[PDB]
Amino acid sequence: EEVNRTLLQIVQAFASDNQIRSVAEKALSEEWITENNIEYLLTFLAEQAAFSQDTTVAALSAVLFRKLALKAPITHIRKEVLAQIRSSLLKGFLSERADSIRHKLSDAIAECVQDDLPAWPELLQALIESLKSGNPNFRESSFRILTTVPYLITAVDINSILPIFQSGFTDASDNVKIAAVTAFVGYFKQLPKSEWSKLGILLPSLLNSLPRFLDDGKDDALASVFESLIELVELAPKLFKDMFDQIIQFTDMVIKNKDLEPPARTTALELLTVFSENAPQMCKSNQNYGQTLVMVTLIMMTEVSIDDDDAAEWIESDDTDDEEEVTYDHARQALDRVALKLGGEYLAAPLFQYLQQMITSTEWRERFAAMMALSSAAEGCADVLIGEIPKILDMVIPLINDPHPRVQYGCCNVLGQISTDFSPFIQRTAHDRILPALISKLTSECTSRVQTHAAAALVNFSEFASKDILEPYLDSLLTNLLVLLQSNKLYVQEQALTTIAFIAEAAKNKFIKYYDTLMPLLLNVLKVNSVLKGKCMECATLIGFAVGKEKFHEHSQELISILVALQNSDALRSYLEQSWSRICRILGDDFVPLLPIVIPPLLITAKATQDVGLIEEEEAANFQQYPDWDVVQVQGKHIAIHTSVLDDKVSAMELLQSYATLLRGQFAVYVKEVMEEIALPSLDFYLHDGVRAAGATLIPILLSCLLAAEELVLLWHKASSKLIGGLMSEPMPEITQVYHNSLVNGIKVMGDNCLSEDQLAAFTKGVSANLTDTYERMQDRDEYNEDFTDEDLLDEINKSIAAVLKTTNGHYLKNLENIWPMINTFLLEPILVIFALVVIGDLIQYEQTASMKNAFIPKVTECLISPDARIRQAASYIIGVCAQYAPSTYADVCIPTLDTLVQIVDSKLEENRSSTENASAAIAKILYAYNSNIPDTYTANWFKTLPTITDKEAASFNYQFLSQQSNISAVVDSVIQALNERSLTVISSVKKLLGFLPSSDAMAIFNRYPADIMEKVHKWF
């Protein structure tokens, strides 16, 4: 009795005042959640939720019990008490409770069902009977429990559970249906695939139940069902195979019914779209999918400016998206997503069938839709469309002058989108059509929105246009954009500025002659609307970099004085930082005196802490609404992380990094500070990988700055050690790669013997944990379903090992022995194989490997003739390196294989020109090691593999060997080719050979060579 009113007072104190409520909070956490009181507390809260006549106490207790029962956890609760808790929870559930309390009871009950927990067959019985209750809330609540605890589905007899769900799908109550569908999908969510076939057979009942929602006009409930179905498509797309046409046709039917509210229609579209992302082969094998998908997104794209045919409201607004045009926005993203998954082969035809027709409609909305659809699809359909580019402009460009301004904006949109998506080929070949088209829209004759969008599209075009292509168009581009600069509308001016900036960036030195007109107009705008000023300083400094320092000097001082005023006076802050940074690229070392102005603010931003809020289950989701926040669950609990702030930290770190890169020795004074207060702490930012990576790349660059100008040695020890330590903790494979790369770059900077023996040992463990977890993730990649990330990581591990070998000067062989099992497993899935071979090549570089000759040559010799070029490459290099560093413990292999090599050689094609060049070098190595001991055809074979133009270290050997007939023209050319291709003293050898021939015989060899390479030849000989 006592315990009860203590606890009762506490929980009642929760609703309320700080004092009474804080006393209760402490009491709960410090006194009641302890080994000694936990079961009393859980017992209490279960009893309150079950029996309390007060709504709020009941609700709260149910929630608290749920939370605390995890943490306990339920497993360490005494059997007698579990049972009592179970029985009261259950009695409460079966009693008369408000809906939301039964929900919370259900959630509490779920915490009491567990693999290790004793069977609770009274629950099973309660659920079965509740499912048949005439009270919807009982039925709904039971499916909810089967959602939280899908294992219970396995526990019921299969012939009971099946009709339970079938009744569920078909229930009179919407709520019950939604919960049945939720429970049904939850099963697949939670259980192994080997359990899936047991409920999979229910899919047709579910699909067949769906037309009922449209009959009754229950579209909100439809949307929820569509959301469950979307999750099921991501889990088991192939389950939908047999009834694919029916679900396609159904989503079609919903979307077209445009008396329905948006949610049913947007979720139906999503359902359709998501098949392309999870079962592409399925979509592609069915012409109906593509046709339906195109047709419905085209319908939805026309849903703009409704009830406003003149677009007055659109004409009058800024250049942002109208948040009321939801289905339009959805349609665009969907077409884009499917095009990107399926390609043009499959969608262009159906797409264009419709566009040809919509371009000609008298309804403007359809002519617009056409342009926006093309815009959405062009990237994904590039494989086909990139070739039919005159045809596309023939459709679009006529519309640039449509009576309706929104159709015009639409056409500008396409010219913009494709300038990006088909770049750089479109800039080269359609400039003569695209630029005049966009330039004509800049005139003040057109509407603000159109002038702006045409100027936006000129950013897309410019980004990939060489200065020479833009040159004849600059005066025209510029005179027009100046007028836009004089607009009354802020967004027109802001666009004008950005377009000029980016045109100047592309124009480079060709912009020098426009600088005197622009620069004063820009200075005037600044001396006077935050974004205007920012875009204005951005325009100024991009012009500055375009024209170079000398020209920039006519206004740099004044510009700098304005920036100072601006900086010390929120989107502006970021334009300011970029501008200062760009001035540092212009001014070079002359920036040094400005570091004390510019660096302090960067230090503040780059010192941002991992802004975490240890957060509550409910209190998430709505925290998630904000683009600037995310929530995850890491080790059970919920964490709110301020994402934007951490993006900004990265951006600042990238600027510090770029100052350090440009200023070299002159940045040294900041190295210790940035290293200890920014780079290093950033590795411990487990919630944001950008930070971790940005911290990593900063390290070698900081070291290199201090080098150029004891401390250095300390910092490197600290930095390398945290890098190394990151290898055994870092969860994200892409980051792990950055660390290895970062070590490589560190080692390269620091030089000889930069690592200590313990570090070398700690590295090895990290290398092993990395290899182990890569193996484990990869041995995971079906009945129900249709990774360079991994390849890239292994690529870099190769580099770090190599780098470590080199700094240790061999000594790392010792440590390298511990991961030989690991290496060996890899050697005998192509990516792991390539890796292994690459490692072995490095090993030999430092005849102490005999211990393993027998363990690998069997696989290497196999690999030589592999269908895979990357394997042959790595293999041959190994055999060649054998004859170089281990001449004698390897002969029985090298000379036999030698015929294999003459065959692998025979190939000379971009994709494998690299592999055959290694083999070529590999045979020249064998010919060297065992020079007059060979059974000589060989050398004349080898020669016919010249020239070597791609692999540099290979080329380096071959021409060294060449430097030790009427082959004379092929001798020379073999060299000119290597030089000219910049792949590789053999010159000295050659001049002597040309000595052995007349005036006229000598000259004639170069007779084939064009002017430009004869310039080089003169400067080589």
């Binding site: 998206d321 993203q333 913009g416 989108q417 599209a457 950005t498």
Partner: peptide, 10 residues
Amino acid sequence: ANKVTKNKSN
């Protein structure tokens, strides 16, 4: 803001 692009809520 301030090129021609397509947005993304996937």
